[PDB]
């Protein structure tokens, strides 16, 4: 039905600019108020900008925390909402969601504001020296996020991925998969890792040692 899908996130240096967007389907975009809400661990959910309709002369509103720095706009013809962000600071790091008050949220796009450089992950297989537990170690990347899937997202049961831990400007995480020993290694188990910031896509097959 209603689908809200953000894009444009990434890394930028303090003082820099970024423009993010989202496109909405399954409703008539031009009839809905649009806003941006960001989320971070230290501050929670924070509404930052909102735009009204053509009939309201596209009236805009901003949180005090960002007024002067953010500009919200919409292209009704493309069903696309934008957020232009200037003089970004590290505190502006977070997941930015399109939020159509009050009913709909997007998937989020991640924005990192940092002087550290983008670095792609190194992906390593975790294979053992009824059931068997395998894994992938995803090491040495910046910024977040990565996505980890197994057998291109097909293998979904018995999976969990651990939160990344930052050390020394680089993140490491691992993902765990538990399958019947009748299924591996007789059939293949492959972890798929994507780090969009470095535009990296890596598949690592787990092979017995």
């Amino acid at each position: 039905e209603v689908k809200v899908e953000e894009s444009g996130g990434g890394l930028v240096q303090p003082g820099g600019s970024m423009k993010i967007s989202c496109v909405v389907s399954g409703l008539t975009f031009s009839n809905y108020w649009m806003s941006w809400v960001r989320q971070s661990p230290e501050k929670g959910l924070e509404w930052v900008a909102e735009i009204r309709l053509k009939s309201d002369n596209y009236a805009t509103y901003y949180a005090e925390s960002v007024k002067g720095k953010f500009t919200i706009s919409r292209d009704d013809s493309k069903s696309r909402l934008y957020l232009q962000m200037n003089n970004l600071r590290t505190e502006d790091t977070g997941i930015y969601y399109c939020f159509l008050p009050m009913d709909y949220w997007g998937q989020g796009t991640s924005v990192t504001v940092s002087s550290a450089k983008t670095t792609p992950p190194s992906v390593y297989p975790l294979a053992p020296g009824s059931m068997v537990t395998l894994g992938c170690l995803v090491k040495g990347y910046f910024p977040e996020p990565v996505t980890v899937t197994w057998n291109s997202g097909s293998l979904s049961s018995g999976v969990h991925t651990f939160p990344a831990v930052l050390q020394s400007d680089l993140y490491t995480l691992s993902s765990s998969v538990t399958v019947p020993s009748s299924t591996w290694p007789s059939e293949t188990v492959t972890c798929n890792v994507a780090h969009p910031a470095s535009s990296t896509k890596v598949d690592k097959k787990i092979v017995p040692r």
């Binding site: 959910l45 709909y104 020296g129 969990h160 765990s176």
Partner: protein, 216 residues
């Protein structure tokens, strides 16, 4: 400005019994039109927020009738009557009476379930990592309950402390368990100066640790 206040946590709730999450506002959300403009959102682990309740008591489309909400202009209560494992997540209150739009800090629902020992797996460094000059030893402590747990590393029998990084999952939406990874990271050079590598998991489910080891 309106401040929405809710507790970060709630008492762990047994499956099939009721949970109750509170919120309060700094200003009445009861409008002259008779509607109390109070909303509840759930954010399940790894997901976006989704609307549960609008206008204080009305269920969003698809939301189970296990969910219900009541309140005044300033004090509100979300009730989940017979909690399921799928219900874990963070529940946020919000108002719709003014800009800025503000949210509560979120209340995390935890499920109390039967104690479960971890399943422990240890993994030697990959040949790829070794080629690169690195050596990470990984221990998974999977699907245990309750959340508290301790891991100890040993190298050739002696406790090793530094170079170890730990990470804990959120409570699982299917089995209500927790998991933890512990990673010991060494240089290839240091790794190849020792032979035996051990991780030991201590959990309330036994007075003995669960010990996993390999020989290089």
């Amino acid at each position: 400005d309106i401040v929405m206040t809710q507790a970060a946590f709630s008492n762990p709730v047994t499956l099939g019994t009721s949970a109750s999450i509170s919120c309060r506002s700094s200003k009445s959300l009861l409008h002259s039109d008779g509607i109390t403009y109070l909303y509840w959102y759930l954010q399940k682990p790894g997901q976006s927020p989704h609307l549960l309740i609008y206008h204080l008591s009305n269920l969003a489309s698809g939301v189970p009738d296990r969910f219900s909400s009541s309140g005044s202009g300033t004090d509100f209560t979300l009730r989940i009557s017979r909690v399921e494992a799928e219900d874990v997540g963070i529940y946020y209150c919000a108002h719709n009476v003014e800009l800025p739009r503000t949210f509560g800090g979120g209340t995390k629902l935890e499920i109390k379930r039967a104690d479960a020992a971890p399943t422990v797996s240890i993994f030697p460094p990959s040949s790829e990592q070794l080629t690169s000059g690195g050596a990470s030893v990984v221990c998974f402590l999977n699907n245990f309950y309750p959340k508290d747990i301790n891991v100890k590393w040993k190298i050739d029998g002696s406790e090793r402390q530094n170079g170890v990084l730990n990470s804990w999952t959120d409570q699982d939406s299917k089995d209500s368990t927790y998991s933890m990874s512990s990673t010991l990271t060494l240089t290839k050079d240091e790794y190849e100066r020792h032979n035996s590598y051990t991780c030991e998991a201590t959990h309330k489910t036994s007075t003995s640790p669960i010990v996993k080891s390999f020989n290089r």
